[PDB]
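Task: complex structure prediction.
Instruction: return structure tokens for all chains below.
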Amino acid sequence: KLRIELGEETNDELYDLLLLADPSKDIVDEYLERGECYTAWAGDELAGVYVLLKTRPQTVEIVNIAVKESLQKKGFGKQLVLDAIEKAKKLGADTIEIGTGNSSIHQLSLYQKCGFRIQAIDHDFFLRHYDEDIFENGIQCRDMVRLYLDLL
Amino acid sequence: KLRIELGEETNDELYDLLLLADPSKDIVDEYLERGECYTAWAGDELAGVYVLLKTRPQTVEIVNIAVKESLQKKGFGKQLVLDAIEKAKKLGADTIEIGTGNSSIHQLSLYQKCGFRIQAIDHDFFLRHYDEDIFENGIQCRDMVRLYLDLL
Amino acid sequence: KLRIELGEETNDELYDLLLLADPSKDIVDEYLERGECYTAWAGDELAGVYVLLKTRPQTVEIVNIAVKESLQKKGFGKQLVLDAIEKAKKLGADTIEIGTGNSSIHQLSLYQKCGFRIQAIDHDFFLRHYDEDIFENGIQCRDMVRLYLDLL
Amino acid sequence: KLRIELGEETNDELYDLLLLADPSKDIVDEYLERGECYTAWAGDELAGVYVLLKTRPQTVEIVNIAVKESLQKKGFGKQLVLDAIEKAKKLGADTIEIGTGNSSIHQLSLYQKCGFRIQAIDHDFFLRHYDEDIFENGIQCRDMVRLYLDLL
Ligand SMILES: CC(C)(COP(=O)(O)OP(=O)(O)OC[C@H]1O[C@@H](n2cnc3c(N)ncnc32)[C@H](O)[C@@H]1OP(=O)(O)O)[C@@H](O)C(=O)NCCC(=O)NCCS
Ligand SMILES: CC(C)(COP(=O)(O)OP(=O)(O)OC[C@H]1O[C@@H](n2cnc3c(N)ncnc32)[C@H](O)[C@@H]1OP(=O)(O)O)[C@@H](O)C(=O)NCCC(=O)NCCS
Ligand SMILES: CC(C)(COP(=O)(O)OP(=O)(O)OC[C@H]1O[C@@H](n2cnc3c(N)ncnc32)[C@H](O)[C@@H]1OP(=O)(O)O)[C@@H](O)C(=O)NCCC(=O)NCCS
Ligand SMILES: CC(C)(COP(=O)(O)OP(=O)(O)OC[C@H]1O[C@@H](n2cnc3c(N)ncnc32)[C@H](O)[C@@H]1OP(=O)(O)O)[C@@H](O)C(=O)NCCC(=O)NCCS
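Output:
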């Protein structure tokens, strides 16, 4: 359904989504440039977005993925993930990664449903990389769950 | 609410619950003996059950926990977990553990809500310890998520 | 070479070894009882010792292993490890574990040489379970390296 | 002691070092370009070399480091690592990574001595990414030990 295409021009409407995932606009711009940003449109409305950054050799990661609140929960999330996997294949990558907070129960499900498997956990991650205490779904988000998926 | 008390007598009604979690009745009997089995009643009806087995030094694990299907989703799950943590405290244990399949999204939430933090993952676990392919919530259950919780 | 046999009687000479690995005599006694303690003699002299404790279901761990300083570095270490693996086999265990501090470079080698593979890391472990700062080989020992080895 | 400076010209003498670490010349060229390659000279002789590749956002990794065999073991190894950490700081990175095979006991020590801490293990890594069986120090190298180090 969703029509996804490459992106090169960032505007307030787009930053709104990218900022839903990564609050720090600074860090966003870093990988937004060094990485590939794709935008998904549903007609004329900006549905969602996701960035593919290249990390370790032969390894690529989804450094950011988001869907407009008024349009999420409709299945666009899964479409983007499954799509990022395809862009990653044509990129010749061997393994694709992505990670979120231990509190993000929903995502922990979604990603796995798209083939991702949990690799390891970066303990105290959010504790040392953030000033305040992040909370979500009655859980203290303080660990970075790392997931991966081999393409072969 | 739920009234939990020690258990020493196993009967079909009880095995029904223990088998909800661990299918293998053999393995169950092993830790059922070497471990402490508690039963929770809601009046005269057998609500749920859970076993506390001692693993590493100063470490105890919830090798099994279940709640009657016709009574689960009412909050008894959380009560048992929170209760097992108390039995574990009086047992002088330093850390308490518990782990489930990566597909068990619901549990991954519950346990964390009771303080548990994800430790590490036992990759391909269910692949080598089971013959068939376990599936749940549209996810291929094949990894053993290990969680823990220090008591101090 | 080393002659290893079951043990049931603890004496100062034996505690000296067990305490080389685990300083806390209290914790030692715990698993010393609940676990199986084997002693290795080289003639009439107490060469070394090791304890096999049963942790998770079908899983056994070497909660302690040591060799008299005046006799270590002669290869008795490896013999005990390889021996504990055999006792573990006859015990019908599926997997055997053992872990040490990230600073224990020597052991990280030894164990792997006996088939052990690194599983996961318990970050900050020694930080929360000990009062002082442990140091060894110019490394700040603060992480618990968990290793395992399937028996099949 | 060692004089380290940026590099842009690759010659047989340099590839000799880079290939000591990563045999695959192909993969080397990939990160050799997308990454920053520094060379360390001890007078007029090419002492060693190391490459800083940028992986995850705010994260940089030492994708390759080596020292001329006839000059290693003199402490140049440590100098390069400690130097890569400084180049990484001025690069504004938050965390720096580096990983080697579980068999590389020597490095497991070196890196830790430079502040690196073991993060997680990529099981069966070398089994699926290499055709032959790698061996070293009487150990079957088949796991990728991942280390990291926060810069703040
Ligand atoms: C993460 C995100 C992109 C994906 O969004 P999404 O639209 O919410 O998720 P989807 O609707 O596409 O998920 C589909 C799965 O979840 C399940 N699901 C749908 N509604 C559900 C509900 N109410 N409760 C539990 N599961 C549900 C479905 O089973 C579906 O799987 P299926 O296709 O196999 O049937 C969106 O939540 C978001 O952008 N959030 C804010 C930013 C963020 O967290 N970014 C990522 C960090 S880098
Ligand atoms: C996993 C298990 C132990 C926990 O049981 P549970 O009672 O079913 O789960 P809970 O009710 O406690 O779960 C919490 C949910 O119920 C809801 N809830 C809590 N109190 C409630 C109440 N008084 N009334 C209605 N709903 C309530 C919450 O909304 C919560 O969901 P949320 O986290 O999304 O907000 C039980 O599901 C089970 O034994 N299942 C099968 C066996 C198995 O797979 N075992 C493996 C472990 S060894
Ligand atoms: C770790 C320990 C169990 C193993 O004992 P060990 O007998 O002393 O060690 P080994 O002799 O088998 O060790 C092999 C090393 O000695 C060297 N060595 C020298 N001569 C040797 C010989 N003739 N045969 C075998 N190794 C020899 C090797 O270089 C080898 O190095 P490597 O491990 O890097 O490969 C023992 O050192 C000990 O108990 N130390 C203190 C307590 C402790 O750390 N306990 C474990 C905590 S759970
Ligand atoms: C990794 C490498 C660059 C560094 O080389 P190096 O010169 O051999 O190592 P160094 O001499 O500089 O190491 C010094 C540290 O290790 C320690 N060390 C020395 N001998 C040791 C031993 N036998 N066992 C454990 N530690 C030892 C020292 O403590 C020293 O630290 P210190 O000064 O604080 O006391 C070199 O080994 C190499 O190029 N190897 C092959 C390629 C490879 O595998 N590269 C990495 C893949 S990413």
